Amino acid sequence: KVFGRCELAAAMKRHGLDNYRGYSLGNWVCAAKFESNFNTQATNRNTDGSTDYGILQINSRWWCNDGRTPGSRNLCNIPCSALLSSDITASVNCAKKIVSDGNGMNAWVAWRNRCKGTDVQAWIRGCR
Ligand SMILES: [Cl-]
């Protein structure tokens, strides 16, 4: 599923991300835009052999099991395919664990380079 901007903002809010660990909703929408273009089915391979999955591009090195990342962990205790569902619950729950791990949203390189320090509220402006 390819979300619309305001549609995703609403789903993220219902699932508890607005000001989760101090990050307003616009931060999460901006992050999803540049990680996945709002597409739940986005995948991208990393040079180390891991893969990033879903609307927030969660990495199989640490967070989910895809059966093809040797020496990896599965800290969210899910198959990586669950992060590709049209239902974003698994992605959101795993993202909350990531953002609580000490580096905040700097765990997402696209957030650090394209969202951090910008007017991220613009990503939710106009939304009901
Ligand atoms: Cl933080």
Side-chain angles (χ1 to χ4, degrees), residues 106-111 113-120 122-124:
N106 296 289
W108 289 273
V109 61
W111 179 82
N113 291 326
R114 304 182 72 174
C115 303
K116 187 177 188 175
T118 75
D119 179 47
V120 298
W123 285 100
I124 54 155

Side-chain angles (χ1 to χ4, degrees), residues 31-72 74-91:
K33 171 68 184 172
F34 292 129
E35 290 293 350
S36 66
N37 209 25
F38 301 147
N39 181 0
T40 65
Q41 295 193 266
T43 64
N44 285 288
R45 174 68 29 84
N46 303 309
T47 60
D48 77 340
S50 62
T51 303
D52 297 342
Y53 294 86
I55 205 122
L56 285 171
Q57 285 298 273
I58 289 167
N59 183 318
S60 65
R61 168 71 47 201
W62 294 107
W63 305 105
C64 62
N65 175 233
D66 61 9
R68 55 154 279 121
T69 312
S72 74
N74 178 16
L75 294 171
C76 293
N77 187 239
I78 51 164
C80 298
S81 63
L83 303 172
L84 304 183
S85 169
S86 57
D87 172 0
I88 68 167
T89 304
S91 280

